[PDB]
Design a protein around this motif. Structure first.
Motif, PDB file in Angstrom:
ATOM      1  N   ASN A 145      58.169 -22.053  86.983  1.00 17.37           N
ATOM      2  CA  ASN A 145      56.867 -22.189  86.508  1.00 17.37           C
ATOM      3  C   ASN A 145      56.182 -20.464  86.720  1.00 17.37           C
ATOM      4  OD1 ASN A 145      54.035 -22.341  86.155  1.00 17.37           O
ATOM      5  ND2 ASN A 145      53.831 -24.339  86.899  1.00 17.37           N
ATOM      6  N   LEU A 146      56.013 -19.885  85.510  1.00 13.27           N
ATOM      7  CA  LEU A 146      55.818 -18.484  85.544  1.00 13.27           C
ATOM      8  C   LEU A 146      54.417 -18.366  85.821  1.00 13.27           C
ATOM      9  CD1 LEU A 146      57.496 -17.406  82.018  1.00 13.27           C
ATOM     10  CD2 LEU A 146      58.541 -17.315  84.448  1.00 13.27           C
ATOM     11  N   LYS A 147      53.520 -19.180  85.731  1.00 16.59           N
ATOM     12  CA  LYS A 147      52.197 -19.131  86.346  1.00 16.59           C
ATOM     13  C   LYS A 147      52.155 -19.461  87.883  1.00 16.59           C
ATOM     14  CE  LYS A 147      50.217 -22.014  82.636  1.00 16.59           C
ATOM     15  NZ  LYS A 147      49.790 -21.193  81.685  1.00 16.59           N
TER      16      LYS A 147
ATOM     17  N   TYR B  13      58.314 -13.760  88.866  1.00 14.04           N
ATOM     18  CA  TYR B  13      59.321 -14.056  88.072  1.00 14.04           C
ATOM     19  C   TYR B  13      59.348 -13.639  86.721  1.00 14.04           C
ATOM     20  CZ  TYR B  13      63.510 -16.931  87.389  1.00 14.04           C
ATOM     21  OH  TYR B  13      64.901 -17.442  87.268  1.00 14.04           O
ATOM     22  N   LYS B  14      58.193 -13.706  86.106  1.00 15.17           N
ATOM     23  CA  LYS B  14      58.053 -13.230  84.750  1.00 15.17           C
ATOM     24  C   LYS B  14      58.355 -11.959  84.323  1.00 15.17           C
ATOM     25  CE  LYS B  14      54.793 -14.412  80.753  1.00 15.17           C
ATOM     26  NZ  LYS B  14      55.059 -13.226  79.886  1.00 15.17           N
TER      27      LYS B  14
ATOM     28  N   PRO C 226      64.960 -16.150  81.205  1.00 12.97           N
ATOM     29  CA  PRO C 226      64.760 -17.391  82.137  1.00 12.97           C
ATOM     30  C   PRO C 226      65.697 -18.278  81.437  1.00 12.97           C
ATOM     31  CG  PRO C 226      62.394 -16.650  81.679  1.00 12.97           C
ATOM     32  CD  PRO C 226      63.431 -15.551  81.045  1.00 12.97           C
TER      33      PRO C 226
END
Length: 115
Positions: free
Chosen positions: A39-41, A46-47, A53
């Motif tokens: 979950n990039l939010k 991570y993003k 991904p």
């Protein structure tokens, strides 16, 4: 080259066999870090860090919709899942160990099914 070909390897079962492998990866008890996209939010860093991904649910949808041209493109996405995991997670973590375990599991199935 033109009009000069190696004998034709039977690739007619590849789709079914990659599906079976992926089912076996989905059902492994150590699959949980990999089942769904990160979950990039909700996961700082991570993003920006993980440029491509990949997760099992995304591979399953690509597989099911004819987005793998051949069995090598399939293996590249599976390995991407584990390469991403090593990029982001310490080896000495539950997720880091999970990734090594799953990579091993995959590579054996891959060799035994296709090599």
């Amino acid at each position: 080259s033109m009009s000069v070909k190696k004998p034709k390897r039977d690739d007619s079962k590849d789709l079914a066999l990659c599906s079976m492998i992926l089912t076996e990866m989905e059902t492994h008890e150590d699959a949980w870090p990999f089942l769904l996209p990160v979950n990039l939010k909700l996961v700082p860093g991570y993003k920006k860090v993980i440029k491509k991904p990949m997760d099992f649910s995304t591979i399953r949808e690509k597989l099911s919709s004819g987005q793998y041209p051949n069995l090598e493109t399939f293996a590249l996405d599976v390995r991407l899942v584990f390469d991403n995991c090593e990029t982001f997670n310490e080896d000495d973590s539950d997720i880091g160990r999970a990734g090594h375990n799953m990579r091993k599991y995959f590579e054996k199935k891959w060799t035994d099914t296709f090599k």
